[PDB]
Amino acid sequence: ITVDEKLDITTITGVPEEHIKTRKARIFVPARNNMQSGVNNTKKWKMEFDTRERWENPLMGWASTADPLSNLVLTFSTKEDAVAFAEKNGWSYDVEERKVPKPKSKSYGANFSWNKRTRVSTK
Amino acid sequence: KFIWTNHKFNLSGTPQQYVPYSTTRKKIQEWVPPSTPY
Amino acid sequence: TRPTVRPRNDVAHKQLSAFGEYVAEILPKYVQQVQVSCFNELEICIHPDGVIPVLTFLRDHSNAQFKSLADLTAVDIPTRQNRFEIVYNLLSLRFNSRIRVKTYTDELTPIESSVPVYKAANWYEREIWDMFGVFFANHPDLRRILTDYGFEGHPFRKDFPLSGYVELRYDDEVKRVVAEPVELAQEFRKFDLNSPWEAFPAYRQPPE
Amino acid sequence: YRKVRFVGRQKEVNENFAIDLIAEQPVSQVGSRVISCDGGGGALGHPRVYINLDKETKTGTCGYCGLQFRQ
Amino acid sequence: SNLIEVFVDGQSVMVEPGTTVLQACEKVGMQIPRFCYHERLSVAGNCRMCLVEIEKAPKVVAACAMPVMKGWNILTNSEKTKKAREGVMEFLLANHPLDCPICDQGGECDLQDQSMMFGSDRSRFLEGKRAVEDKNIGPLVKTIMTRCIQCTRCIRFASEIAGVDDLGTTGRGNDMQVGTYIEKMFMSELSGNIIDICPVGALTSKPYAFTARPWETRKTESIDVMDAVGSNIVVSTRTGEVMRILPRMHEDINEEWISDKTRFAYDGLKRQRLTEPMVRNEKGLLTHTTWEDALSRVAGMLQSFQGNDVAAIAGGLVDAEALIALKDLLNRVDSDTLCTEEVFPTAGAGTDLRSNYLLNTTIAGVEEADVVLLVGTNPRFEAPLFNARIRKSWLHNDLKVALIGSPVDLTYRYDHLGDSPKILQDIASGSHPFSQVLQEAKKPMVILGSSALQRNDGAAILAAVSNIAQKIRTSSGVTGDWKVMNILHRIASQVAALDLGYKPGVEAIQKNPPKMLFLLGADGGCITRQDLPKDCFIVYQGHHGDVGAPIADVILPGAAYTEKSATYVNTEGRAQQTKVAVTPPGLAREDWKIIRALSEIAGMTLPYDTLDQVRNRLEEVSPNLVRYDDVEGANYFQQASELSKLVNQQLLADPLVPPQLTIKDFYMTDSISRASQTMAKCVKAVTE
Amino acid sequence: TSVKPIFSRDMNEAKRRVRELYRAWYREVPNTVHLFQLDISVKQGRDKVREMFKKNAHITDPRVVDLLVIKGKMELEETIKVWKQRTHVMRFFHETEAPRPKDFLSKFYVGHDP
Amino acid sequence: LGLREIRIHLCQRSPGSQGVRDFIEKRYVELKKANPDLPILIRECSDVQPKLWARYAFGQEKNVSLNNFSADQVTRALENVLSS
Amino acid sequence: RFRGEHALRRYPSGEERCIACKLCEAVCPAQAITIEAEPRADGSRRTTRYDIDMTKCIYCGFCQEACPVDAIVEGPNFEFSTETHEELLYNKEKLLNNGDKWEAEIAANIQADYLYR
């Protein structure tokens, strides 16, 4: 047995170096690259970090850099388990919101009226 | 057409060693101050 | 359906259905989910207290030998509320069959090591310690394999960014070969390839 | 500031240019409506695209072909 | 109550009596392939690419436009649906050129993200492919109408929201084109917004045109500041440089639409820019300097002057974080005397609870109004997306709109009521018709614009319209509360600036001659050195050098709007934090951190260093600058309206004229408009 | 907290275990200074150890302290023997790396907000 | 100086703040009829402890915390600072 | 079908057969290619910078087969061995020179072997 019940907040340290207090994370819902119309790109809460300098490598023009995180997207399933990872490793954050549209009221056949204003042509 | 004359070589420093460079225009083109008169 | 589509058979799809039916019937203290893979393989979910006995039941028996440990591996999964995933894999040499043992876990909760049951998993368990940080209990020799003497990241997990922190170099400032902060000469471009329209209707998630 | 890397290195650069070597082509004429240009020979060169040649009268070098094409 | 239980794929779902098969199947999480149907448009049936096999029926119907009767079995995946989608989308991919090496929608186009997933596997034509010719429309929209799946989606745009009826359908059978029959150019506001609508590579961008394919960009969301409502964009960096920006489809502002100026003005970010601190040299010379020369230079003069001989003006596009480090530096030395560039008259209130200074009916309440009256403004070329919301709400239900002053071109049938300030005074009484329809209104809306209030009679027209806003609300008023009196703007960082506790209108500096000024206004010439006293210095802090940076003592660089995490506030008190895209080039720095290193090299040192400590200093002064995107219910202006009756200024004799031209004033306005040469290249194509 | 511990139970066997291995490292500073032929002063090697244990004293929980033990227990394999060829030990002493400013005004001249 | 202005914070609801919601009804139009110099500010929502800032003497803060007064205590606790 | 030094062909009388369609850079497994196009003044689009490292080049043959307009070709000459790392970075205007030192070599190869692929 020896199950030793208590309560203490799980915070871990030692594994990164100094980027705990310097960088605030960011959790967002990605929203539909609008040149197309497919909505599979939504439905996953992600997180993503800050952007820092990108100078020029003065022999070609390669945008070389420090900032070793810079390419990390994780895919979390929900808000409830979103913030439950920024605390267990212990860095700050800021939370966006999910936006779902108007339900809405559309009806073909309402484009032809007797006294109303919605009446389309040129089709 | 567009063929070379006889041949060439891969000469490590001949003195010519091709010394690669960048092939773009500069990006931001910083603004210069106005002239010496006021 | 046509050529260039894999033909299945219902023989092994019925036998491996029927066989591992009674591995949940005769040890219902540990086994908490069994599902049959469509390509004639078996998965069996086991609570981490049953790490030693359900191997030990398998290890010697008349009906299920499974005497070869092919592959011990480990997968990490954020958003699961219990991170990792330990996956055992065995081989019935008398019977030509496969079964996988999928035991979930966490970081701080230890796992009783399978050193005494199989002596194949001596090196398969020192390794996983280095790559994720799972602390296998009472291991006879736990050490540092496949990493340098200075890594403190356990790099095969999702929190370690791809290039490290410790990009190395030489200098003549004394004689030594010394570390540095990481310094790339190219960005490592991150392309975006995940295209919409949800092409797979069978595996579709519930709507919510 | 930058030009010191080729001191005594002869700075090997291109000699011919195709920035405009289009213009020496005797721009082809047909007297039709739409023409194919899989230019450069079959099973090589750019894919076949059909251009409308009716302005007063040019095509537009196919987008791929480069060679000035017209009626 | 009032629903039909309809079974999709053998699974129940409850929909209203009058929805579509499209929306109902989109409720349980499925996307039928769409071409001829966008949500914010009307509905047509002219591509036939949603073909659901409805169960227990011989025929196949379109799920775009039909009702849903008593509970069907909407059977999506069958063996008759999948023989139709595969058969329709072999037709249109026949008469089509063989691009995708060079066509610019090579990353997203929906003849390509259908045709792996749905649709066929190989081609059988095997020769043909008719080829129509292109033309020009404007210097914004490259137009290759060879590609053209003829879905009639761009044409229903023009007859809808952007009310210029210019495009058409010309021909019969296979022989038809889309573009304008005469050689007329098609240009207005929202004119470049069609290149998102166009589902294949026909309409594509002119300045972006051939630079980069869209699987390489790094999308980071951000908010744009060139206008009143702000925006909702997403920038797209390639290698540390902005390539193009898009809309982001917030549901209340930018429903899916973006403004044309806000789309094509990223060039002004990177053309004509100042990068380094510069020293005086005593003549009209002005030369660059190392960073530790010109810090204690200006900080020497702070210890000398005291009292109201030092001031600052700031009225452009700087945030609400580099407007706190200014206010706590000039008022710890106790010399406030500072104002914004914009002129706003105060009579009884204006800095305190502001009472109408934010737009009280929000944008989402505009669709609920019934009689909208608006005075003193040309709403078309300032906040255009608010104008498009009127255009939507004028359609789809009834609305009655009247305007006072300067007959201009609005796309919906208004009526020019009158053109004088004296129309306001008479409409407080009952005369000159509509006369009581505001009294006979159920949800009124009376907008004052900020174009007329800048004038010299601003304290009169502020109190005049507040009287008739009192007159309606004291009658019933609406049902109901329904806040009435409201205002919009045309400068982005004013509501952010003014509700920190500044004064409005440059009058305090307009009377006295203080010695040193700090310019963050600045390019509007409401103060010149001639209106100033003699050659005593002014120190300039900005990022562009158009007007005011040549006439300056020491200039300091700053980061513009894509380089710093900031805060901006539109006309409803929302707070929309822009985020980092590029780090600022050269020796430029962020604005609010050059102020602390001006402070700490001088005497007073401010008690905050990091950005989180800045926003707690914000939360001290105004607690609603961390309540992001929320509109609270607080009006409190029955007390303000009687207290604003204190000033008794009268009207004037001048027609309430807006500055805006036919279009041409729309392009070149702020600062980034000016340096961006594509605005300079689309302005001479208007005049010709 | 329903999970078995590693070695300790609650706050007492742990905070005598961490005091045990400190007496190992205090003994095994002046051995490696000649076992690798490295020429510094011996008091430098003792300063780094008493620096290192004070770093982690913000813990209010068992089996996190026990996790740091296992790392601290492991290093005495390599360090007391000869498995690090003079170079993996000397990385704790950042001799090459330039000093960081760590004060506000010196960051502002050089570097875009580190 | 002192002084320059003050900052009346409140909350829209959580009705322990209800003294200011009557104080605006009683003494704002009577309050700001006096002192046509001092631009006292009203802001939105502290949501708890509806404080009242004062700012004067080279930018120094003085913050009383009226949590739940009457309509008459807020009538008289303002001229603690307004007189001084 | 041998793999080796790189080249960029061009049409009969020259057109610089490349069209900057950005595929030879998206299936390099090693991310060697670095293309930055621009609308050239005549209207047809071309490259400005084109960069192939000869050290990250893992020698697939994935550039050779992804190209629609049949331009970039792994040319059949293993002549190499320069003395500086500053040199093996290739520009655009090396490859053309290196691709017009021969085309009698390359076009004899591709005509033999395009019939299979």
Ligand code: SF4
């Ligand atoms: S521009 Fe082309 S794709 Fe767009 S609606 Fe017109 S024909 Fe269809």
Ligand code: SF4
């Ligand atoms: S519009 Fe469609 S068919 Fe034309 S090039 Fe683009 S993806 Fe190909």
Ligand code: SF4
């Ligand atoms: S060779 Fe082909 S893939 Fe490479 S740049 Fe040219 S067109 Fe693009």
Ligand code: SF4
């Ligand atoms: S050979 Fe392969 S790795 Fe090398 S440049 Fe070509 S595609 Fe890239």
Ligand code: FES
């Ligand atoms: S699919 Fe668009 S019309 Fe039915």
Ligand SMILES: [Zn+2]
């Ligand atoms: Zn051609």
